Amino acid sequence: PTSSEQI
Amino acid sequence: EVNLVESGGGLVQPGGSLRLSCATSGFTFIDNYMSWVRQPPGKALEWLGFIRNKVNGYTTEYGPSVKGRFTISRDDSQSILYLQMNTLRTEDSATYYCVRDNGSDYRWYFDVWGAGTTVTVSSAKTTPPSVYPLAPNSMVTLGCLVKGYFPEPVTVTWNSGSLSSGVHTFPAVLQSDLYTLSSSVTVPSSTWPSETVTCNVAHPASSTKVDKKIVP
Amino acid sequence: DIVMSQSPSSLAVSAGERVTMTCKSSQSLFNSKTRRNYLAWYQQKPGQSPKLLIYWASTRESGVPDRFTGSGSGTEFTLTISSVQAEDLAVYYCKQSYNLRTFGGGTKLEIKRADAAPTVSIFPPSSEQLTSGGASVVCFLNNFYPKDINVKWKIDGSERQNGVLNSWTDQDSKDSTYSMSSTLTLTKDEYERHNSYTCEATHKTSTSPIVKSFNRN
Ligand SMILES: *[C@@H]1O[C@H](CO)[C@@H](O[C@@H]2O[C@H](CO)[C@@H](O[C@@H]3O[C@H](CO)[C@@H](O)[C@H](O)[C@@H]3O)[C@H](O)[C@H]2NC(C)=O)[C@H](O)[C@H]1NC(C)=O
Numbered sequence: 001p002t003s004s005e006q007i
Numbered sequence: 008e009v010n011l012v013e014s015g016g017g018l019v020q021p022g023g024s025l026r027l028s029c030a031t032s033g034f035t036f037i038d039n040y041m042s043w044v045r046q047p048p049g050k051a052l053e054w055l056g057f058i059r060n061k062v063n064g065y066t067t068e069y070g071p072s073v074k075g076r077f078t079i080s081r082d083d084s085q086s087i088l089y090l091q092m093n094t095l096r097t098e099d100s101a102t103y104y105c106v107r108d109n110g111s112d113y114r115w116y117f118d119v120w121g122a123g124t125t126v127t128v129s130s131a132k133t134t135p136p137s138v139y140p141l142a143p144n145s146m147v148t149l150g151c152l153v154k155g156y157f158p159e160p161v162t163v164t165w166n167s168g169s170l171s172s173g174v175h176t177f178p179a180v181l182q183s184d185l186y187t188l189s190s191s192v193t194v195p196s197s198t199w200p201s202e203t204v205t206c207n208v209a210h211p212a213s214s215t216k217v218d219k220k221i222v223p
Numbered sequence: 224d225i226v227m228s229q230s231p232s233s234l235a236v237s238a239g240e241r242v243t244m245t246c247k248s249s250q251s252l253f254n255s256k257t258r259r260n261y262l263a264w265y266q267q268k269p270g271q272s273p274k275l276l277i278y279w280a281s282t283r284e285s286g287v288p289d290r291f292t293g294s295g296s297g298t299e300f301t302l303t304i305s306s307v308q309a310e311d312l313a314v315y316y317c318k319q320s321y322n323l324r325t326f327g328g329g330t331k332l333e334i335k336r337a338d339a340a341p342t343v344s345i346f347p348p349s350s351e352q353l354t355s356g357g358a359s360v361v362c363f364l365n366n367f368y369p370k371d372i373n374v375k376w377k378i379d380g381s382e383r384q385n386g387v388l389n390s391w392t393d394q395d396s397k398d399s400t401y402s403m404s405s406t407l408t409l410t411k412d413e414y415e416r417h418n419s420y421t422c423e424a425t426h427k428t429s430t431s432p433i434v435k436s437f438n439r440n
Binding site for chain 3: 001002003004
C-alpha cells in the first residue's frame with residue numbers, strides 16, 4: 001500500500 | 008509561509024491539450040511528494056494523482072478517471088510541479104488544485120493547497136459581457152445585469168469593493184453558449200441617489216473591465 | 224480503486240447542536256506497518272480551497288477547534304461536530320490515503336435558522352439594453368428562508384412561462400438566508416406589445432403571494 005512508502 | 012500557485016488554467020477547445028503549472032515557495036520542494044486534485048463546478052473533489060520525490064524515482068500514480076490521458080511531472084531545480092492534460096473532454100472542466108502530499112512520519116495527507124486554476128473545456132468563443140444598470144421604503148435595492156459573456160468567471164463588486172454588505176451576486180446561468188448573471192445591492196434610501204452607487208464587472212477571460220453607475 | 228461513501232449527502236443543523244457524518248470505505252484503510260487508519264477529513268467553505276481538519280482517522284490538525292472529532296477504523300469512520308457554529312457552513316470530504324487517494328462524495332452542512340419572507344424587487348429593462356434591441360425584466364427575491372420558493376411572471380395579467388431563468392444563491396454568509404434572481408428575457412418589440420409586468424413570489428412564510436410590478440410608461 002502506498003501509505004507504507006518512506007520519505 | 009508555504010505557498011502554492013497554479014497557472015495555465017484557461018479556455019481550451021475540446022480535443023486540445025493544456026499544461027498546468029504550480030509554482031511553489033516556502034518549503035523544500037525536492038523533499039516532497041506532490042498531488043493534483045480537481046473539482047468540477049458544484050461537484051466533489053477528485054484525486055488526479057501524485058508524483059514521488061527524487062529519493063523514490065520520480066514515479067507517478069493516477070486516479071482511474073485520468074490515468075493514461077494526464078501526465079504529472081516536476082522540475083526540482085525550479086520547485087515547480089506540472090500537469091500535462093491531453094485529449095481534453097468537457098468532463099475536464101474544473102478547478103485544478105496543487106497540493107503538498109505530506110509523507111513525513113507516514114502521515115500522507117494534503118496539508119497545503121493552492122487557490123486553484125480553472126479549466127473550461129468548450130468550443131464556445133470567449134465573449135465580453137454587456138453590463139447593464141438596474142434601477143427602480145427605508146432602504147432601496149439596486150441591481151446590475153451582466154449578460155452574454157463567456158467563459159466564467161466574472162468578478163462583480165460595488166463601489167470598487169466599498170459596498171460589501173447587502174450584496175447578492177447570483178450564480179451565472181448558461182444560455183446558448185453565453186452566461187448571464189445579476190447582482191443586487193441594498194442600501195439606505197438616504198445614501199442614493201445621494202451617494203453614487205457603481206457596479207464593477209471584471210472579466211479576465213476577455214481582458215474586460217466595465218464600471219456602470221446606477222442612475223435613476 | 225478504494226471506493227468511499229459518505230452520508231448524509233447534506234444535513235441542516237442549528238448553531239449549538241451536535242452533528243455527525245459517516246464515511247465508509249470498501250477496504251480497510253488500516254495499515255499494519257504504520258499502525259494507523261489512513262482516513263482524513265477536509266473542510267471546504269464557500270469559495271475557498273479544501274482545508275485539512277483531521278488525519279489518521281482521529282488526529283486533529285494544528286489549529287483546528289476541539290469541537291471537531293474524528294473516529295472509527297477499518298471501514299467505518301465518523302466526523303462529529305459538537306456545538307456547531309455558523310462559520311462551519313461548508314462541505315466536508317473524507318479521503319483515504321491507504322493506497323493512492325480517493326475522496327468521498329462529501330456531506331454538505333447547511334445552517335438552520337428562522338423562516339424569513341423574501342424581499343421582492345422588480346426592475347424594468349434598462350434603457351441601454353433597449354436601444355440594443357434587448358429587453359430583460361429582472362426580479363429579486365432576497366433574504367428568505369427556507370430555500371424553496373416559487374415565482375410566477377404575469378404580463379398584462381397573463382402568466383408567462385417562456386424565457387424565464389432563475390438562479391439561487393448559496394446561504395448568505397451573514398444571515399444564512401437564501402436569495403433568488405428571476406430574469407424574463409424578451410425582445411424590444413415583444414416587451415413593448417404589452418404594458419403590465421408583474422413578479423409574484425410564493426413562499427411558505429405566507430399564504431398570500433408577494434406581488435411587485437410596473438408599467439412600461
Ligand atoms: C508534514 O507536516 C508536519 C506537521 O504539519 C511537518 O512537521 C513539523 O514541521 C515543523 C516545521 O517544519 C516543526 O516545527 C518546528 O518546531 C519547533 C519546536 O517544536 C519550533 O521551535 C520551530 O520554530 C518549528 O515550529 C514541527 O515540529 C514538525 N512536527 C513534527 C514533529 O512532525 C513536516 O515538516 C511536514 N512534512 C513535509 C514533507 O514538509
